Write a protein that binds this ligand. Structure first.
Ligand SMILES: Nc1nc(NCCCOc2ccc(C(=O)O)cc2)c(N=O)c(=O)[nH]1
Ligand SMILES: Nc1nc(NCCCOc2ccc(C(=O)O)cc2)c(N=O)c(=O)[nH]1
Lengths: 274, 274
């Protein structure tokens, strides 16, 4: 399949050999500072080493603006939190880092402080200027599907159209094709039922010709199906990661790294990946 | 898909609604008797109730002749062990029971003592007379793929041919089509690599037009891929059960019932089963 590797500055990721595990960094902010305090940076570094030891290939690190139950946060604010965490994890853990942000100033600073991949939940549509940051630093950029409504004419046809609008924004900024990753955005502007329909038809995403990241870890559509709370979603999650790899994804973005790494590796063996 | 239900005397199994979990009964024999002692029958009954409570739809119970690290055992011997266990589990747990045996006298006695399904690892080839027991009691019969060599010309073509030889034995004894289940026999007369090749191509088994049971729970091909001991094979197992359901299986035969039931149910939701 892939005739190139994902170039991540110091690191190379081969897309043919294995499904790549991206581990979700658990960020617990210190009640008493706006960023860079010992307890919260040390929590982040130890969690990254755990994930590295359990099999992660990329560490994903987010600021308050994109991470669930928080209010919106300033750009100045998001940078103080996240940049000390990038610096520490980057020096201390030998894996590429993706910065999860949709804001172009936050992406730029995160890269300067040692990030390799940009993870955008708005697919360059919130701030088109982020695709300019990508092209300049020449870093991979994940363009996730998202929209500000759930009025689909045909769920998958529309998702593909919305992903191409993202791809067009990126390429018009000089983003090289080999620095584009797509994401179907499970959980984002989709009913519980639309989420399962996108799972059921993920293979259609491969016609665009770019690697696909999948992120279903613990999402509430799992809780919809199984009737289970967030901490009881492991098995449900593992089902979506296996279906996702049978359907052609190159990455998955998971909390339960040790578990999902074993499922990934068994699946790779069976489909004949690598 | 299925225009009929699996009729199991007292119980009916709908093949369209859900993947059916068959739970593997843990049989720990009493050092001091040849069968029917309290400790070992009570262990069996409590394990069945655990599996019922965790989501199992069928309980699978085997005698010494088919269960791994034991020597061959007599017919008289296999009946004393297994028949007290059938009687107790059957009265006490409200689910169909399958008797795992390839011997026609053992199958007959197990049914008389309350079993609903026959599970034959030799596919009626060890003792063709078992298909006569099936037809008479009019019970479902699982015909697993197995052979006495690993000289395949084309693994899957040969498996399908060997399964049809089984089906021909069964039908020539008066086994109704609706009482036939096939099994690709993962682990049986196949290298670690042949096992993955059968996983990769299980969907071909559906051309025969019968429900398919899959049993990969903890098998050593998982240990081959992941380099993990028997008790560390949960994630590997879950991968094979999901690929198996994406490929059209109606049953899986599992040790880890609670876990594999959640994965089964998420998968059902995504493929649109039920
Ligand atoms: N690209 C991509 N990013 C994602 N997330 C980035 C935005 C922030 O999302 C978070 C979701 C969960 C967590 C957490 O549980 O700690 C932290 C952050 C996806 N899912 O949340 C996804 O499916 N794909
Ligand atoms: N039909 C069918 N029967 C099977 N087994 C019946 C024969 C006895 O096999 C056992 C395998 C494991 C265990 C156990 O771990 O307790 C007990 C019995 C399959 N796998 O072992 C299979 O994949 N399909």
């Amino acid at each position: 399949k892939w005739d190139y590797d994902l170039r991540c500055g110091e690191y190379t990721l081969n897309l043919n050999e294995k499904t790549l595990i991206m581990g979700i960094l658990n960020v617990t902010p210190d009640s008493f500072s706006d960023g860079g305090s010992y307890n919260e940076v040390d929590a982040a570094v130890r969690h990254a080493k755990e994930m590295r030891d359990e099999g992660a290939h990329i560490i994903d690190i987010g600021g308050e603006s994109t991470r669930p139950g928080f209010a919106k946060v300033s750009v100045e604010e998001e940078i103080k939190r996240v940049v000390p965490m990038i610096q520490a994890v980057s020096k201390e853990v030998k894996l590429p880092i993706s910065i999860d942000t949709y804001k172009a100033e936050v992406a730029k600073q995160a890269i300067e402080a040692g990030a390799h991949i940009i993870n955008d939940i708005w697919g360059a549509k919130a701030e088109p200027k982020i695709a300019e940051v990508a092209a300049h630093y020449d870093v991979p950029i994940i363009l996730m599907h998202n929209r500000d409504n759930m009025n689909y004419r045909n769920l998958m046809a529309d998702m593909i159209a919305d992903l191409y609008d993202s791809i067009k924004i990126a390429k018009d900024a000089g983003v090289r094709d080999e620095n584009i990753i797509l994401d179907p955005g499970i959980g984002f502007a989709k009913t519980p039922e639309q989420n399962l329909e996108a799972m059921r038809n993920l293979e259609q995403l491969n016609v665009l010709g770019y690697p696909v990241l999948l992120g279903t870890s613990r999402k509430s559509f799992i809780g919809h199906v199984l009737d289970l709370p967030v901490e009881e979603r492991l098995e449900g999650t593992g089902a979506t990661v296996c279906l996702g790899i049978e359907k052609g994804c190159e990455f998955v973005r998971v909390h339960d790294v040790k578990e999902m790494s074993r499922m990934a590796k068994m699946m790779d063996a069976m489909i004949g990946k690598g």
